[PDB]
Amino acid sequence: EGNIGLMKAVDKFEYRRGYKFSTYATWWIRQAITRSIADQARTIRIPVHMIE
DNA sequence: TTATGTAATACGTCTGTAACTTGTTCTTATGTCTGTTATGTAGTTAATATAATTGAAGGATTTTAAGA
């Protein structure tokens, strides 16, 4: 899931902004891990809003 | 003997009950449409950070494939 996060982060990276890649990629990989663990870690799915 | 007149008696029968049936009329339960709110889904965030992880343990014998 974090790997998918990297692919999506690379697809929309901007180096005009001058920040390093790790800072932007960490956020997207965080989102990947959290969304996947909210959607697929239970036998009975609990919607994302109820997860938060 | 025979007309006459009462009387038993059997059969129509006029009327009172009841069954079959429909009109229609009113009431209600249901199916459906529509409007509103809550639920469910999805996208994004920009100091930097760059090889897990947690145990677990006094077994005793057989048979059968790999390695040499």
Q: Distance, angstroms, CA A33 to C1' B18? A: 87
- Under 8 Å CB-to-CB from A29, ≥6 apart: which residues? A2, A5, A6, A9
> Would you give the DSSP letter of residue A43?
S
| Encoded amino acid at A7, one letter | M
- Sequence-distant (≥ 6) Cβ neighbours of residue A8 within 8 angstroms: A28, A32
Resolution (A): 2.7
d(CA A33, CA A23): 16
The spacing between the Cα labelled CA in A17 and the C1' in B42, in angstroms, equals 26
Half-sphere exposure of residue A10: CA atoms within 13 angstroms, side-chain side:
6
Note the helical H segments in chain A.
2-11, 21-40, 48-51
Experimental method of this PDB entry: cryo-EM
**What DSSP state is assigned to residue A7?**
H
> Is the CB of A10 within 7 Å of strand B?
no
The answer to whether A5 and A33 have CB atoms below 8 angstroms apart is yes
Burial of A36 (0-12, 13-18, 19+ CB in 10 A): middle
Which nucleotide is the nearest neighbour of A21, by CA and C1'? B46
